[PDB]
């Protein structure tokens, strides 16, 4: 198998077939698919049953998680292209550097990554080292350091060495 | 290896970005995606708007068409796996020939393909020439000869020769 965004996020997020609380405490399933920010487990069960189209009882198959994963990766890509701040940054970046941005939008969302501003401007201006240093000072690095370290390596080197 | 089921159906079905009527007469779009059995263009446009999530106005993009195509191919595979007559034939076939069975299901549906009792039994028993002769005797061959010929050649030879 070769290297791509789908294989990148698979190593980062991992697979979980049952409803679990994430790093922020929100109910999630599959390959890091956020169900609800609501504190109720029942609220998450309704969102899951909606996304799958059957009574899941908080349990899904690997294939069912693959569908959500492919849908989330695609949603992240379209989200970047529809965001006025994210799209000019995206188009400038190369194939491998685009994947690193998708990873962040998969993890934090459209609005969350668009709030970086300075780091986004640095990547658009091709300043790879300056952006890498600035990303470590962010709240994203303090919360998930293992995750961010691999993404920062991808944005600075322009290669997928952090996964090889 | 650029040849597979997706490429096989791209050749057989073709790509159309405007609402068209199939061989049967029903409103279709993309790479053979059935919209409705209704003879209304207003009803089909509504079914296309609900499938995409925007005011399409009868026209879709190549990307939107690839989404519907991936959904239909997946649905065709599930149709085989959920069917008790289709699954043992599927599991006994090689990769190239599995694609020819998915092709038939994509085109006719799980129920219609299960009606080829004798031909399916011949495919399960590895009787390639006998299956080829019997499949040509069907209404499927009379209604759409050129597509059936290709699928038959694939089942007969176990190669991609009918396409490339
Ligand atoms: Cl997500
Ligand atoms: Cl038959
Ligand atoms: Cu898409
Ligand atoms: Cu599926």
From Swiss-Prot, chains A, B:
Entry EC number(s): 3.2.1.17
Outcome, altering residue 119 to F: 10-fold decrease in enzymatic activity
Highest taxon in the source lineage: Viruses
Active site: 13 (proton donor/acceptor), 22 (proton donor/acceptor)
Top enzyme category: hydrolase
Stored InterPro entries: Endolysin_T4_type, Glyco_hydro_24, Lysozyme-like_dom_sf, Lysozyme_dom_sf, Phage_lysozyme-like, T4-type_lysozyme
Main location: host cell
Name of the protein described by the UniProt record: Endolysin
Gene that encodes it: E
